[PDB]
Amino acid sequence: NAAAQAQRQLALLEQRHGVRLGVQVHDRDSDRAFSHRADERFPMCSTFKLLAAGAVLARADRGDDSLRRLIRYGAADIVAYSPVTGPRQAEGMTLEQLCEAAVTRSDNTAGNLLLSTLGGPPGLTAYARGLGDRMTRLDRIETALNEARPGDPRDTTTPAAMAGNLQRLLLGDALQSASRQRLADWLLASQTGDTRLRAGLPAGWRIGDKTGAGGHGTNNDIGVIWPRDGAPVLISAYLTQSSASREAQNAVLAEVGRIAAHAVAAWRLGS
Ligand SMILES: *C(=O)N1C[C@H](NOS(=O)(=O)O)CC[C@H]1C(N)=O
Predict the structure, then answer these.
(1) Any catalytic annotation for residue 82?
(2) Known active-site residue 142
(3) What is the Å distance from ligand 1's center to 143 Cα?
(4) Coiled coil: which residue ranges (predicted)?
(5) Is the CB of residue 101 less than 8 Å from the CB of residue 107?
């Protein structure tokens, strides 16, 4: 029973690190799933940028906005961890450049600029509702949204709700084909999760992921795994309440990646 074994492995991993760990995995090949705390709330932190890019792409699909539109912004708009938008402030950036900066590089000002085209955090929440997600809510902008206070509903998702969004966006009909590919490309080009889920994957497997990190020992990684020989796999991993270093948190997420990859391989072999 690969799903039961994966869930036991997650429970042991969570306990030995003193964290609260939320995971949802769904293999599109076997259609099998496993989870831990999949319906509990966790802070999104930078992972909201996946949804913000999805909402911008959906607007582009409908003609409600354009990826080629030039967005101007000021030095006053720059927030921490904005390595792309900061240097380009005087010239501005197009919406597609901002989507890429937010998703591939986790650029915080880029995330805020995307939100400014969507109606702010309320618009991102409305977008999640339109995807059938009744749990996710964004309430603050960068970097206030990273507070990650236990019990606080603001700026949270659930592992299952976010996995559902990943399915609709990357594998379902929430985006047209060209936009689906753009989002996959931005996720697959990211390096920010090299020591997180990706570090746990077998050679020849790929992940297009969106990382995040916040207060109260919060560290997240969500995305789509494309295995060496299998259909895609949805994965959402939210870790919080760690008292350990960032590197130690990253290693827990790498182990989640190993647990997930083994379950997928076992389903494929019929183990
Ligand atoms: C996202 O959660 N953030 C943006 C940036 N990149 O880290 S990530 O790759 O884990 O997303 C710094 C951490 C965090 C933030 N403080 O906004």
Answers:
(1) no
(2) yes
(3) 9
(4) none
(5) yes
